[PDB]
């Protein structure tokens, strides 16, 4: 499957500093398109991608109301969770949630998602069947019991299989020039002496979209996984990403190393080496 739509919601309590803050950002792949923040002067759902701007007044009003109520729901959920864990009302806590759908090249549902984490630890998750739940502990089991009783999975499923896939398909059509375009990385190898004995060979990948990519080094055709330093893929700010991998090699043996790059915007994977 080639695409996904997903919402990343964060609710944070702050006793003595107001009601818990709620923020929700929506994405299509690695492209953000909406944001909602309860701490904004006038909280409303607002565009963060040009292709969502054409959407009408009713679209904005409806999603604004949806997130205002979700703000209340997650505040009540934070209260409940404090109870489930016998925590004091003095501490600060975080309730995160990710939900959405993945679709194939043809637009058909690959899989749905709906999970939560409390203070950075997995809490409850809708299973891939879109019918049952997996709870991480006895507190999560309380949420599971209430959800099973009210038949919540059935509501999430109707959305994840219907409405979510319909929105994703519409967004993909409206933003086809960017959402459906993969930008390949610009690549090269740099060389930095360390001493008379060793040097670093660093391999670059710049300007790529989407973020998914694989850079690896080999000495004499053998992957150097344990000896390679890799940095986390980082956003450039123009929608694209960057990344590098480095290896310290003995002076004079530079030609025994090759860097390999795989990216979806590349027809065939690349092989490069230091060119003095």
């Amino acid at each position: 499957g080639s695409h996904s739509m997903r919402y990343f919601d964060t609710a944070m309590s702050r006793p003595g500093r107001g009601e818990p803050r709620f923020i929700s950002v929506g994405y299509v792949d690695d492209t953000q398109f909406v944001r909602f923040d309860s701490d904004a002067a006038s909280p409303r759902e607002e565009p963060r991608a040009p292709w969502i701007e054409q959407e009408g007044p009713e679209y904005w009003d409806r999603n604004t109301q949806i997130f205002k109520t979700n703000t209340q729901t997650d505040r009540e959920s934070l209260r409940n969770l404090r109870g489930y864990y016998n925590q004091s009302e003095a501490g600060s806590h975080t309730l995160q949630s990710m939900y959405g759908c993945d679709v194939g090249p043809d637009g058909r549902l690959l899989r749905g998602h709906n999970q939560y984490a409390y203070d950075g630890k997995d809490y409850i998750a809708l299973n891939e069947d879109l019918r049952s739940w997996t709870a991480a502990d006895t507190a999560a089991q309380i949420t599971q019991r209430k959800w099973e009783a009210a038949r919540v999975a059935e509501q999430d499923r109707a959305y994840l299989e219907g409405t979510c896939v319909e929105w994703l398909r519409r967004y993909l059509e409206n933003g086809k020039d960017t959402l459906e375009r993969a930008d390949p990385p610009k690549t090269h190898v740099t060389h930095h002496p360390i001493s008379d004995h060793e040097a670093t060979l660093r391999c670059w990948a710049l300007g790529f979209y989407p973020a998914e990519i694989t850079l690896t080094w080999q000495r004499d055709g053998e992957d150097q996984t344990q000896d390679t330093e890799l940095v986390e893929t980082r956003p450039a700010g123009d929608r694209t990403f960057q990344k590098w991998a480095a290896v310290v090699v003995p002076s004079g043996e530079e030609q025994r190393y090759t860097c390999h790059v795989q990216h979806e915007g590349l027809p065939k994977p690349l092989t490069l080496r230091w060119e003095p």
């Binding site: 759902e45 979700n70 959920s77 969770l81």
Partner: peptide, 8 residues
């Protein structure tokens, strides 16, 4: 498009 969430 978003969805109505439920209380934990």
């Amino acid at each position: 498009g978003g969805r109505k969430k439920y209380k934990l």
